[PDB]
Amino acid sequence: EKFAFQAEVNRMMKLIINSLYKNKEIFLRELISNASDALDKIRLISLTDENALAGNEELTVKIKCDKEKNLLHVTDTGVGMTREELVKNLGTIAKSGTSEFLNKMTESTSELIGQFGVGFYSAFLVADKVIVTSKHNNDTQHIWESDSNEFSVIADPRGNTLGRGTTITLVLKEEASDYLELDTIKNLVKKYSQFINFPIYVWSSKTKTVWDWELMN
């Protein structure tokens, strides 16, 4: 139920960290493209699958902050992940390179983390804990949880609430407090959604103050 990160993931996690202490806001870029990739993969799958979109009809990205409890959620209706994918895809880096890329890191690292798809780990730049809730079309909903010193994957007590897709939940660090106010999340979401192909919304105030989803691109 508990697991240890692979050694290179630790080396990578530190390399991502002490190289982008200055460009902290790139985590939201990497979470938004990581959602698009996931949303693509299910649109591809839906070409050859009469029922790939059973678990959820829509293909969106929904971002919700939560200043009262210090949380940022980024939820896509993409392909989702299984228990085993959670453990392997997020507990290992072995897809290609995986040691090749840690030379050139230490050898303006903002571009290169995106190139290699390891952008997920920039989340630890602003989070004390990172929580991945995900639902694949061939598995039950699971939760992945880590503070970088280990992680655990558990079945979700709540059943299937996602339909299909993934939530990234960040328990934000204290310094990162400004990513909890509307206007500055919307700000960064616009800057990084310009070329994403799916609609991206932000639970927002259009004041009698009322909250609906607000589209950003």
Ligand SMILES: COC(=O)c1c(O)cc(O)c(Cl)c1CCc1ccccc1Cc1ccc(F)cc1
């Ligand atoms: C499909 O995934 C999502 O649902 C999703 C999603 O829907 C939104 C997201 O923000 C993320 Cl991160 C995912 C998971 C992305 C993913 C998915 C599969 C493999 C790897 C990766 C990232 C990764 C992790 C560790 C590495 F070493 C390299 C890359």
